[PDB]
Design a protein around this ligand. Structure first.
Ligand SMILES: *Cc1cc2c(cc1C)nc1c(=O)[nH]c(=O)nc-1n2C[C@H](O)[C@H](O)[C@H](O)COP(=O)(O)OP(=O)(O)OC[C@H]1O[C@@H](n2cnc3c(N)ncnc32)[C@H](O)[C@@H]1O
Ligand SMILES: CCCCCCCC/C=C\CCCCCCCC(=O)O[C@H](COC(=O)CCCCCCC/C=C/CCCCCCCC)COP(=O)(O)OCCN
Ligand SMILES: C=C(CN(C(=O)c1c(C(F)F)nn(C)c1F)C1CC1)c1ccc(Cl)cc1Cl
Ligand code: SF4
Ligand code: F3S
Ligand code: FES
Lengths: 143, 131, 235, 592
């Protein structure tokens, strides 16, 4: 016994385990500043790192299967391609994604030296991140 | 993507069993933590000396910015594969997603070279694109 | 004249397994009720529908049995206070991303198997010769404050989005704080082998410093700073 | 309809408190196959709520002696304790706190590197005439919390098969000896039969038979009702202890360390309870005279209250630096249910039920007892043992000294594992019994599940709680104890018409609360009959019609029998042992 009584009890428990549901995780949780200001640090680099890859795999594909691309050759195709009202919807949303990732990467270089990790310091370095983003992102439009 | 058959209910056994931890593989553990902190410590000062520059950078200061931007972007795409496409639930397609982060980032380094030697820089492409 | 507040409790019955889960609505008179949430759950069970199942034991907040998700955040039901305004309602749920047994009872079997694997006991090799205790200073005993007094409620583990998806392999913020309680102990001379269970891909290195662990702890401890010192000690 | 699963072990321990955990790995470090059956997770037991210390005569702040500790345990019980278990407990007490530190208990330190120990009430040195001694050996406010979490982590070092969330129903018994238990898996819905050679009961006390108590929600008497249903007696059930401090309205507790270093109970006039009405010249005394100080203060009018049943305890005298280092767990548990700070205004206090000095009659080595029906001597029950709060060795006797209940768990959980190894050899065949061994315990699980009556299980539970608080209380006489026996008998005849509206078998919590009501009705009906038959006053049982303590006729224990609910209760008595283990090590203490 105790091995015949462990197989027999795991047969009816592995049968009941397969019909249990999962409790909801998103869509019920409270919106806080700890996981809303941290999902803007993964979104902002995926949307920016894709543009960095696509513009360097284009110059490195046209080297092998040679078409002869140049920086002033693609700049006319992008400038002349979009109307005026969508030229500023693209560049108006890359200025604020650059300021929230530049000012959020200094927030993480402090947190690997184990400083500013109390609850009083997680919130006061996150109120500077919303002030640094709204000023640097608007100054980059005037350039 | 085809999904491997999972454990029934998420668990298997009695509470007096134990989790058997993986062997020590510190090329994926502690040494990977070193590489993610060298690329971040050298893209924050180098981008700050690009908002204070009159025009484009020199080809000694622009190649060192572009190679340190590719490794910084590789190490975060590496960390989204291992959170969402895992070997527990997909199996073979955890490694096939890590080989297409191979020649989709080895052609990228060839694209850095054909920007730096004929045209001027990566920063000389985005400054002329505008923002 | 009574004051009726409306509660909304999660329901599931494993004898009808094809029925979807849903929220059921009760109304409790707040004049003859206690000030806490557990005092209003125990009246729905006694004077109304008595098939509502949940865990409870001390009603003080030191064992950690009544962990649930009350109003959006993870807390204990015997500390959380009823907002005395009958114009609003309340939504009670189980702990998030857990396989439920019956109603508000999650299956914490994986949570107990991960806690056994960190070896939570002293591992010396020698003791004094006269039969007296092993010495420790006052400044080394002060290093243990704020760490040994976790009640194992798993309210921090089931708020970490890296533990929502990867929980069959990532140890969570509640087990990784008790692994630090034994690493900085000055009487435990087994340190090199307690840092070889954590030097792989995903046992420690799925923490991305979101910090919902330190925000939702009902006892006021800091499990998000204790993971920042294990990473700094493996380097 | 049912299917039964058969296990087979050597020793089975029922309970995972501080006594059932110490005895569990004490038997698995000796080569035995042990199984620990628990209803909760082991770090959610009631002994996580303790906030005092563990008395031990270590002597690292002044000189000390273990014979001084023995005199205080003997005097403080009104000479009803067994003096051969006081001599054993107070001798093995220094050896079990140094051994408990080698497991990793984070004791508070002293500036030499040694354990720090404070003062409770009762311990005076030099044979009861001298200044107050210092031996309590405390962690700051979590002595009970840091003792479960260390004893549980040491049970994982060895092999101990924990069966978590099982509800034990009854003892299997064949021809006067016990052969195992029968349980019920809550998660799955199965019936399990365990078979063993020695089964050890460490369930705990019953405190939820009263209206207001300091106990948990799961502190029902479950081991005392398994034993009483098999035909065995229970001992000294009349001595219930009423703690002096406890929160008005709910029952929550502040520790007695709040009076160890600075504490005044200030009434409506503004005096200290030190003399002149209901007082001993010294405060910090034993827990029932101070409890008989407060209850005599409120009725004559000398008490502040919203309905004039209320008191105070000042903590504004203490410096603010000592309130964060010595008692940090008190400042947070008062500002939630009472809503006031500990530094500016005093806190409300009521006396409530604390501890039970009664249970299974036991020898000092762990073996359970009965009495013979021919000559009236003692008799060992084959196969049964007990330890913890559910046992009655008579170390506490008639009155409990503070911080001696955590020493009770460690010393007599270590002595249980030591006398099994001296009797039982590992590896032994089991006897083949009939195939329906324990068929009358599943016939009761079926009746209480398909129940249909008029009274719900939460309505009959309220007629038991309001009866025991009205009649069996602090002040007793033989005109309100006879009204308690006639009322608790009428409540027991309404359990025949209970009503249950949950027929599931997976986490059927409507069935577990009406199984715990059958256990509390057996334990509460034997307390009202035992307390109405002792015509004297000693310890925590004070009779107003007999105010003197009698020694020549009433220095004996009480044993009570009751088989089922609504059945007659009988009484027999046994003598108290008044000689030590060795007459040359410590002589006996005579009465005074
Ligand atoms: C209530 C209390 C007690 C207390 C105290 C403060 C409070 C609020 N302060 C103390 C102090 O300062 N100093 C001291 O010396 N003692 C103090 N106490 C008393 C002390 O806590 C108790 O004496 C002690 O806790 C008793 O321990 P024991 O091991 O005997 O009991 P337990 O921990 O309550 O055991 C509970 C376990 O039993 C299992 N169980 C119960 N019934 C069943 C059934 N039917 N089936 C299976 N298992 C069962 C539970 O699972 C639990 O593990
Ligand atoms: C630390 C974050 C790391 C970002 C990783 C993403 C990879 C690419 C990101 C950035 C590329 C280089 C950044 C260039 C630095 C800004 C230069 C600047 O501010 O000058 C502005 C140019 O304005 C800007 O460019 C605003 C900066 C935002 C750039 C775009 C944001 C994110 C870019 C994603 C790249 C997608 C494709 C772009 C080209 C492909 C090659 C990268 C005007 O020029 P001056 O007048 O000379 O400035 C001197 C002032 N006295
Ligand atoms: C809404 C989320 C959840 N979430 C994360 O998943 C997450 C994680 C963790 F999953 F490993 N680590 N980091 C850094 C994150 F942003 C954030 C809230 C925490 C989300 C955000 C961005 C993306 Cl592209 C996908 C998702 Cl689904
Ligand atoms: S750290 Fe806090 S929230 Fe997490 S398990 Fe411990 S007590 Fe609970
Ligand atoms: S919330 Fe989770 S991601 Fe890390 S910092 Fe805490 S364990
Ligand atoms: S009941 Fe123990 S913490 Fe809520």
């Amino acid at each position: 016994m105790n091995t015949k009584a462990a197989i027999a009890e795991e047969q009816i428990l592995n049968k009941q385990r397969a019909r249990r549901p999962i409790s909801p995780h998103l869509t019920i949780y409270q919106p806080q500043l700890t996981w809303y200001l941290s999902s803007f640090h993964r979104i902002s680099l995926v949307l920016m790192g894709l543009g960095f890859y696509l513009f360097t795999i284009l110059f490195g594909v046209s080297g092998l299967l040679g078409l002869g691309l140049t920086t002033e050759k693609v700049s006319n195709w992008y400038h002349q391609k979009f109307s005026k009202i969508t030229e500023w919807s693209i560049k108006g949303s890359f200025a604020y994604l650059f300021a929230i990732h530049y000012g959020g990467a200094i927030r993480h270089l402090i947190w690997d030296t184990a400083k500013e990790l109390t609850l009083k310091g997680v919130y006061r370095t996150g109120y500077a991140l919303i002030g640094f983003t709204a000023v640097l992102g608007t100054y980059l439009l005037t350039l | 993507l085809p999904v491997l058959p999972q454990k029934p209910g998420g668990v298997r056994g009695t509470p007096n069993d134990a989790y058997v931890p993986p062997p020590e593989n510190k090329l994926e553990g502690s040494y990977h933590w070193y590489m993610e902190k060298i690329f971040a410590l050298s893209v924050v000062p180098l981008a700050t000396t690009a908002m204070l520059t009159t025009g484009p950078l020199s080809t000694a200061a622009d190649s060192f910015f572009s190679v340190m931007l590719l490794g910084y972007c590789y190490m975060e795409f590496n960390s989204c594969i291992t959170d969402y496409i895992s070997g527990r639930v997909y199996g073979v397609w955890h490694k096939y997603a890590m080989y297409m982060l191979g020649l989709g980032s080895a052609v990228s380094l060839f694209g850095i070279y054909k920007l730096e030697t004929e045209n001027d820089g990566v920063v000389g492409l985005v400054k002329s694109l505008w923002d | 004249t009574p004051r009726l507040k409306t509660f909304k409790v999660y329901r599931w019955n494993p004898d009808e397994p094809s029925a979807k889960p849903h929220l059921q609505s009760y109304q409790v008179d707040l004049n003859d009720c206690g000030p806490m949430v557990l005092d209003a759950l125990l009246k729905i069970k006694d004077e109304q529908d008595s098939t509502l199942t949940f865990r409870r034991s001390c009603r003080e907040g030191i064992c950690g049995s009544c962990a649930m998700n009350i109003g959006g955040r993870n807390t204990l039901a015997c500390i959380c206070k009823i907002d005395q305004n009958e114009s609003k309602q309340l939504k009670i749920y189980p702990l998030p991303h857990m396989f439920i047994v019956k109603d508000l009872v999650p299956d914490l079997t994986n949570f107990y198997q991960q806690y056994k694997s960190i070896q939570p006991y002293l591992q010396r090799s020698s003791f004094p010769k006269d039969g007296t205790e092993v010495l420790q200073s006052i400044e080394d005993r002060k290093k243990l404050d704020g760490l040994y007094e976790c009640i194992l409620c798993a309210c921090c583990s089931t708020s970490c989005p890296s533990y929502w998806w990867n929980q069959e392999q990532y140890l969570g913020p509640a087990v990784l704080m008790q692994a630090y309680r034994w690493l900085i102990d000055s009487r435990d001379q087994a340190t090199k082998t307690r840092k070889a269970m954590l030097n792989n891909s995903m046992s420690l290195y799925r923490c991305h410093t979101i910090m919902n662990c330190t925000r939702t702890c009902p006892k006021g401890l800091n499990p998000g700073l204790a993971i920042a010192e294990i990473k700094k000690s493996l380097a | 309809k049912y299917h039964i699963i058969d296990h087979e072990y050597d020793c089975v321990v029922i309970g995972a408190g501080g006594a059932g955990l110490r005895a569990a790995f004490g038997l698995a470090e000796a080569g035995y196959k042990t199984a620990c059956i628990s209803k909760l997770f082991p770090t959610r037991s009631h002994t996580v709520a303790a906030q005092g210390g563990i008395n031990a005569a270590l002597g690292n702040m002044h000189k000390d002696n273990w014979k001084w500790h023995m005199y205080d345990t003997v005097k403080g019980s009104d000479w009803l304790g067994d003096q051969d278990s006081i001599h054993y407990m107070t001798r093995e007490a220094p050896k079990s706190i140094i051994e408990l530190e080698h497991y990793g208990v984070p004791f508070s330190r002293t500036e030499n590197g040694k354990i720090y120990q404070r003062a409770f009430g009762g311990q005076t040195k030099e044979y009861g005439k001298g200044a107050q001694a210092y031996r309590t050996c405390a962690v700051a406010d979590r002595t009970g919390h840091a003792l479960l979490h260390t004893l549980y982590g040491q049970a994982l070092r060895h092999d101990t098969h924990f069966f978590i969330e099982y509800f034990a129903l009854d003892l299997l018994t064949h021809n006067g000896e016990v052969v195992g238990v029968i349980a019920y898996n809550q998660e799955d819905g199965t019936i399990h039969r365990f078979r063993a050679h020695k089964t050890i009961i460490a369930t705990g006390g019953y405190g939820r038979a009263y209206f207001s108590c300091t106990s948990a929600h799961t502190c029902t008497g479950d081991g005392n009702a398994m034993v009483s249903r098999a035909g065995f007696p229970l001992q000294d059930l009349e001595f219930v202890q009423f703690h002096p401090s406890g929160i008005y309205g709910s029952g929550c507790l502040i520790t007695e360390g709040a009076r160890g270093e600075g504490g005044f109970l200030v009434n409506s006039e503004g005096e200290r309870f030190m003399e002149r009405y209901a007082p001993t010249a010294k405060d910090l005394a034993c827990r029932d005279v101070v409890s008989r100080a407060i209850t005599m203060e409120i009725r004559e009018g000398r008490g502040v209250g919203k309905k004039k049943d209320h008191m105070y305890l000042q903590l504004s005298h203490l410096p603010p630096e000592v309130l964060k280092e010595r008692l940090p767990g008190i400042s947070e548990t008062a500002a939630i249910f009472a809503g006031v700070d500990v530094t500016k205004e005093p806190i409300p206090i009521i006396p409530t039920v604390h501890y039970n000095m009664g249970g299974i009659p036991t020898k000092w080595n762990g073996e359970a007892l009965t009495i013979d029906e021919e000559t009236g001597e003692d008799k060992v029950i084959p196969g049964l043992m007990a330890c913890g709060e559910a046992a009655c060795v008579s170390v506490h006797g008639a009155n409990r000294l503070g911080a001696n209940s955590l020493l009770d768990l460690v010393v007599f959980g270590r002595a249980v594992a030591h006398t099994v190894a001296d009797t039982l050899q590992p590896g032994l065949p089991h006897k083949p019994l009939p195939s329906d061994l324990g068929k009358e315990s599943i016939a009761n699980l079926d009746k209480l599940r398909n129940a249909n009556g008029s009274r719900s299980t939460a309505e009959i539970r309220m007629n038991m709680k309001q009866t025991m608080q009205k009649d069996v209380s602090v002040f007793r006489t033989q005109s309100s104890l006879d009204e308690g026996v006639r009322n608790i008998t009428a409540v027991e005849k309404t359990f025949d018409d209970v009503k249950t509206t949950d027929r599931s078998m997976i986490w059927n919590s409507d069935l577990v609360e009406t199984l715990e009501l059958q256990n509390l009705l057996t334990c509460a009906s034997q307390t009202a009959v035992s307390a109405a038959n002792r015509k004297e006053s000693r310890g925590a049982h004070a009779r107003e019609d007999y105010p003197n303590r009698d020694d020549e006729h009433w220095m004996k224990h009480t044993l009570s029998w009751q088989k089922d609910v609504a059945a007659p209760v009988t009484l027999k008595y046994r003598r108290v042992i008044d000689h030590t283990l060795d007459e040359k090590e410590c002589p006996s203490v005579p009465p005074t």
